[PDB]
Structure formats: C-alpha cells, structure tokens
Amino acid sequence: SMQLNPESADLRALAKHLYDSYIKSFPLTKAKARAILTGKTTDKSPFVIYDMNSLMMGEDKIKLQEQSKEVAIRIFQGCQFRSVEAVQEITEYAKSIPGFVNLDLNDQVTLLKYGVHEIIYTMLASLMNKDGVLISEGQGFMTREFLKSLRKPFGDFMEPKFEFAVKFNALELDDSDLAIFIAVIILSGDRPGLLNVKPIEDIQDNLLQALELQLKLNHPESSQLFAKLLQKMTDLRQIVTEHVQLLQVIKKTETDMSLHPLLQEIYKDLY
Numbered sequence: 001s002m003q004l005n006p007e008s009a010d011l012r013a014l015a016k017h018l019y020d021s022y023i024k025s026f027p028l029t030k031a032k033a034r035a036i037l038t039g040k041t042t043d044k045s046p047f048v049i050y051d052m053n054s055l056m057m058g059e060d061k062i063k064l065q066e067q068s069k070e071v072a073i074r075i076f077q078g079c080q081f082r083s084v085e086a087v088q089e090i091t092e093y094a095k096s097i098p099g100f101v102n103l104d105l106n107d108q109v110t111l112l113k114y115g116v117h118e119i120i121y122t123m124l125a126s127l128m129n130k131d132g133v134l135i136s137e138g139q140g141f142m143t144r145e146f147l148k149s150l151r152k153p154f155g156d157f158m159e160p161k162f163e164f165a166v167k168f169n170a171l172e173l174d175d176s177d178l179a180i181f182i183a184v185i186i187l188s189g190d191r192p193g194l195l196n197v198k199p200i201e202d203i204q205d206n207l208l209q210a211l212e213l214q215l216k217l218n219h220p221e222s223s224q225l226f227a228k229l230l231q232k233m234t235d236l237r238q239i240v241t242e243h244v245q246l247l248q249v250i251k252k253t254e255t256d257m258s259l260h261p262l263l264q265e266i267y268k269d270l271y
C-alpha cells in the first residue's frame, strides 16, 4: 500500500536525521561491532577474557579499594560504569530526536529515567554474539561462559541479556533500523509521572510510522519484522524488571554492595 508522497519523503528524512545523530552519539555502532566480532575489521583483535587468568591479563592489556574487591564485584562495577557512560550517550541522542528538547524538561528527564535501561540492553545486543560481549569500546571481549562462572549471586546477571540478544540479533537489524527503534522506546507516553502525554504520543506516532516504512524498505525478506519489534519493546521492559529483582536479591545477601549514585537515582521508582 506504500506510496511516494510528501508524507513518506518526510518519514525518510526523519529516518536519515535519526541515523546521522545516532552515528554522532554512539562511537561503537553495530556495523563496527559486527566487523570486530567477525574479524573482518582491519583493527587489532580485542583482548579476549575467557577465564580468571585472561581477566587479570586483560586488566593490564585493556586501556582506591575497588581493585582490592573480588573479581565478580570488579566486573559488576565495570558494568555499572559502562551504564553511566551509556546514559550520557543516550541523553545526547535523545536531544537530537525532533521535538524532544521542546518537551517539558521534567518529561525529558522522566523519559530518560524509564527508557535508558531498555536502550542499554537493546544496544548491548549489538556488541554480543553467542560466545560473548565486546567491552571497553571494542578493546576487549568477555565470554558468556566466563560471566556464568562468577560466584552466586553474580553468575546469572548477564544470562537474560544474552538470551534476549541471540533472538534480537536473528532479526538482523542495522544501525539505520536501531536509530528509529531506540527513538520510539524513548518517546513512550506511558512512563510514570509525565506531565504532558499527548505531545510525547504525537512524536512516537510519527517515529512508529518512520520505523514501519524503514523496515518495509530495508527488510524485503520479512513482513513480520515491525510486529516482532513491538513485542521486543515489551520484552525489554521485562528484562529491566528482572534486573531490578536481581539487584534486590544481590542487596539482601551482599549488603556491602556499592551502587553508583546516578544509577541509584534512576533505579529509585524503577519496577
């Protein structure tokens, strides 16, 4: 039913704008990650962390009393620091979404508070294959089974993210698709405590039309892909819920556990 009209031309311009700002905001794109993971890159191989020995060499190779801490806690704290960096990137990307910076600044903050973890887990899939995940902007690669070997209660925190990634990656989205997918998530009008829902819904409705057109153009091999991505949005909310519960369980049994204060603020009323 697709047409070349002014409306479709505007949706393509919006897709391109979003792609261009995504490239500016996120230094390690899915294209560059896939090239590293396949070896197809001309870059030096990342340092592979597959066991305790290679974890410690990695800490020398990859460029106070935190180092004192046990391996599992140094890794968990590394993931938290990654997430704080990602929040900065996603914030800069959100400001590029047309209409976002004209929303009420409280609503901008609310959308980022409730959206950032869904986007973090989306983009973490770009850096994953069935064996492991890229770390330190592609300088390292940490194996799935090494992460599973960490002592309880830290042996299971990456497993749901890998499970998500294997299925998400089978959809073969590229960075032009992901730019629009992430924008749609950020512009969710059902986040708690939003002042002005209708202007958020208006922006999301337009992004959703831009996403459906992008997917029909870019993926002739599937007519199901738009529907499947709507389901992945709901799946991501359950991944974040499942992570919040895991942090509850970690905290009871590991009460010495330092959570980054920025993440403590984001997690406050996050369910």
Ligand SMILES: CN(CCOc1ccc(C[C@@H]2SC(=O)NC2=O)cc1)c1ccccn1
Residues within 6 Å of the ligand: 075, 076, 078, 079, 080, 082, 083, 117, 120, 124, 133, 134, 135, 136, 142, 158, 247, 263
């Ligand atoms: C496994 N990797 C890749 C990043 O993997 C991540 C896993 C989980 C998160 C979410 C964090 S962890 C938490 O409790 N809250 C958060 O926001 C963010 C990144 C490592 C491992 C060590 C050092 C750096 N990278």
